[PDB]
Amino acid sequence: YDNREIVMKYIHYKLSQKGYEWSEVVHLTLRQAGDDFSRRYRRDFAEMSSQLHLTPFTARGRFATVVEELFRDGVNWGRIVAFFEFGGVMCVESVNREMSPLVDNIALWMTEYLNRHLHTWIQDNGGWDAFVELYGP
């Protein structure tokens, strides 16, 4: 599994499902899990999208701050879905505010975070195959 491909497909999904412009079972499962997360956590989304103040200079710090807090008490599959959903929220708020070049930077930051911070937990917990076994078709 390629974390970059996982990230790229997810962001492309988040943007196109909202009218913006920019192995398959893993992508499909993540789409379903993330759509479920956004239906169940609507109030957390509205608060994040409204409170999140972004500029090309502070975007990485904003991303890093939220993601550290999300994973502070440990990693679980639910928290990883929330990480992709948070990444999607940043991408949508970046396009909304005409800072669209930030989308490519967010994809890079999400890819590095998966490869350097989440990779250990993912493999120790069965890999993406285990996520598909728990929540997929």
Q: Which long-range contacts (CB under 8 A, 24 or more apart) does 40-46 make?
A: 41/82, 41/85, 45/85, 45/89
Q: What number of residues does the chain have?
A: 137
Compute φ and ψ for 26, nearest 5 degrees.
Answer: -65, -45
Question: Is residue 70 part of the contact set for ligand XZD (CB under 6 A)?
Answer: yes
CA distance 12 to 79: 20
Q: Single out the residue of 26, 82, 91, 102 in contact with ligand XZD (rule: CB under 6 A).
A: 82
To the nearest whole angstrom, how small is the minimum distance from the Cβ of residue 118 to ligand XZD? 13
Question: Is residue 85 part of the contact set for ligand XZD (CB under 6 A)?
Answer: yes
Question: Is residue 43 part of the contact set for ligand XZD (CB under 6 A)?
Answer: no
Q: Give the C-alpha distances (Å, rounded to integers) separating 3 from 6, 13, 98.
A: 5, 15, 27
Question: Is residue 132 part of the contact set for ligand XZD (CB under 6 A)?
Answer: no
How buried is 16 (Cβ within 10 angstroms: 0-12 exposed, 13-18 middle, 19+ buried)?
exposed
Question: Is residue 44 part of the contact set for ligand XZD (CB under 6 A)?
Answer: yes
Q: Single out the residue of 6, 59, 81, 92 in contact with ligand XZD (rule: CB under 6 A).
A: 81
Looking at residues 86 to 105 of the shown chain, list those that interact with ligand XZD (rule: CB under 6 A).
86, 89
To the nearest whole angstrom, how small is the minimum distance from the Cβ of residue 107 to ligand XZD? 16
The residues that touch ligand XZD, with contacts defined as CB under 6 A, are 32-33, 36-37, 40-41, 44-45, 48, 66, 69-70, 76-79, 81-82, 85-86, 89, 135
